[PDB]
Design a protein around this nucleic acid. Structure first.
Lengths: 72, 71
DNA sequence: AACCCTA
DNA sequence: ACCCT
């Protein structure tokens, strides 16, 4: 199949700070490049939820960008 | 460098990822090269932890996506 | 350490 | 489909 998906990641606050970036410049790149709908749960909480939604090519791009950021 | 990623998955999807007798997750652990843990019990949302080099985590994640897209 | 977002 | 650190 080629159905749209919704993938949710449970992330530590520190990691989320890196994904968002100063002024949200990192997640802006992820949204503009991946084609995924990306939602990051509200508040600088110890644990946060990142939602990725779209077809597999978009999910793969966003997930790749997230793990690449975290590897930094 | 090694990362740990946690996916939040509904029980229905976890059943598919595990597979009958754990056959599916077994295959994922063997060829992905990642450590894969699926949370115990029956919470509406389960946690699938993927651990190892980013390449192994990505491979495991790809196998999961493939499973969700089956048939 | 970063706080964004078809609100 | 319920695996197994």
């Amino acid at each position: 199949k080629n159905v749209t998906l919704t993938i949710r990641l449970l992330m530590h606050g520190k990691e989320v700070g890196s994904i968002i970036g100063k002024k949200g410049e990192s997640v802006k790149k992820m949204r503009e490049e991946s084609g995924a709908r990306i939602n990051i749960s509200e508040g600088n909480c110890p644990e946060r939820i990142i939602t990725l939604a779209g077809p597999t090519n978009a999910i793969f791009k966003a997930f790749a960008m997230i793990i690449d950021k975290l590897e930094e």
